[PDB]
Structure 1
């Protein structure tokens, strides 16, 4: 345990609760701005994760339409929010940078 790490964890938890996307039941990776890299990364997802993402986004958009939020027991927990779009986006960025490095020569 580190005191600086403790402060970072506390600040990150506070900021997660303040951002408010969890109130609509979304995860962090749902809210990423979609560009070419992210589009390819989403295109590489398996079936079940893609369908879950689609349903979560659809429910969030309906809640936004009606100006409501979920009950507090259905909000996404900060600790259980594990990123599902990390490795795909990481690999896509890695390939793109390899292409750029080849293009430099």
Structure 2
């Protein structure tokens, strides 16, 4: 709302967009994320695979993309949320049942 100014600033400061990454590519793979990734449809998964491949290749060269090619803050879809949310929601149910 009011902190949206800072969110937009932080986004560019963080700078994963400069490698053509979306936020959910940068998530550290724990057991839940692994399962969420595993549940992605062919299209969303192969995009993820490429975006990372591209980022790693850029990191290897110590270079960034052209500014036009950078992930726009507004265009950063939260692609992993629906899968990850449910993976977590499921595990918490099993953890509950176990008590």
Classify the secondary structure of the residue corresponding to 1:42.
helix
Structure 2: stretches of 5+ with no match in the other structure: none
- Bigger Rg over Cα: 1
C-alpha separation between the residues in 1 aligned to 2:32 and 2:95? 14
What's the CA shift string for 1:32-76, capped at 9, x where partnerless? 000110000000000011000000000100000011100000000
C-alpha separation between the residues in 2 aligned to 1:7 and 1:56? 31
4+ residue runs over 6 A deviation: none
TM norm structure 2: 0.97
CA offset at residue 77 of structure 1? 0.2
Decide which of 4, 9, 12 is 1:14's aligned counterpart: 9
CA offset at residue 82 of structure 1? 1.1
C-alpha separation between the residues in 1 aligned to 2:4 and 2:22? 18
Structure 1: stretches of 5+ with no match in the other structure: 1-5
Considering only aligned residues, what root-mean-square deviation do their CA atoms show, in Å? 0.7
* Residue correspondences, number: 99
